[PDB]
């Protein structure tokens, strides 16, 4: 594959491509973009349900072609596989007919409610009664 380096699948180029595709999808699927979240979740607005907030694979192809960041020719199937990989981690929510619109969690994690675990702080040092996931295994 075009994404292999020295016979192995490198991640740095893949991570950069994932980041730029994710940012493009987020900008396309939100009213104004990241500047809708500088104030916080208390004022952000969202697109109407009837609008086409998603972004098909072809839009991603056009953006990556006009950006010239991948620096190599990428087929629509390869970009589809890449954005399907990005579908995991609760990013790039999948919509029928090969459409993508970023999840709200993906932009919430850029900065009890277990879902937003990134906000919670690690336990203090030399503290007892701290819960460990593998304490029973």
């Amino acid at each position: 594959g075009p994404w292999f380096t020295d016979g192995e699948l490198d991640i740095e180029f893949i991570n950069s491509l994932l980041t730029i595709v994710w940012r493009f999808i987020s900008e396309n699927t939100f009213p104004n973009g990241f500047k809708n979240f500088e104030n916080g979740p208390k004022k952000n607005v969202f697109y109407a349900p009837n609008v086409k907030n998603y972004s098909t694979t072809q839009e991603i192809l056009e953006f990556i072609t006009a950006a010239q960041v991948a620096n190599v020719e990428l087929t629509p199937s390869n970009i589809r596989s890449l954005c399907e990989v990005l579908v995991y981690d609760d990013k790039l929510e999948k919509v029928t007919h090969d459409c993508y619109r970023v999840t709200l969690e993906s932009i919430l994690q850029m900065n009890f409610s277990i879902f937003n675990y990134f906000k919670m702080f690690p336990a203090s040092k030399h503290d007892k009664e701290v819960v460990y996931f593998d304490e029973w295994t």
């Binding site: 919670m120 702080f121 336990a123 701290v130 819960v131 460990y132 996931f133 593998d134 304490e135």
Partner: protein
């Protein structure tokens, strides 16, 4: 047969951690609302320990003394039987141990919303 992805340097001693190193994110500092729950978790529990339904247990000399006399009883212990009971719920065989014929007395577990935690 050493595997492809291993070398002799990393093998030789079998050190298992025996201590956890993967913590859940629930260990963060408490919040004011969480501090409330606790109190309604420490208070409850405290009330039932003071409650008549405990039977938790799994000086006292027989010599009469004027010192122990003129001293008040510690409290008015409320046993399990004295509590009012809905007889139709319990099994029949336990009737011999309850207060089937005993003076009615019910204790009210008052709730103090003010925290009893120091500072």
């Amino acid at each position: 047969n050493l595997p492809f992805g291993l070398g002799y340097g990393d093998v030789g001693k079998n050190h298992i951690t025996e201590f956890p190193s993967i913590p859940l994110p629930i260990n963060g500092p408490i919040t004011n609302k969480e501090r409330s729950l606790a109190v309604k978790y420490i208070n409850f529990g405290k009330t039932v320990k003071d409650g008549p339904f405990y039977t938790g247990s799994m000086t006292n000399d027989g010599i009469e003394r004027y010192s122990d006399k003129y001293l008040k009883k510690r409290k008015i212990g409320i046993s399990i039987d004295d509590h009012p009971y809905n007889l139709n719920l319990f099994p029949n065989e336990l009737y011999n141990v309850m207060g089937i014929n005993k003076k009615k007395l019910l204790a009210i577990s008052k709730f103090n919303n003010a925290d009893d935690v120091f500072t």
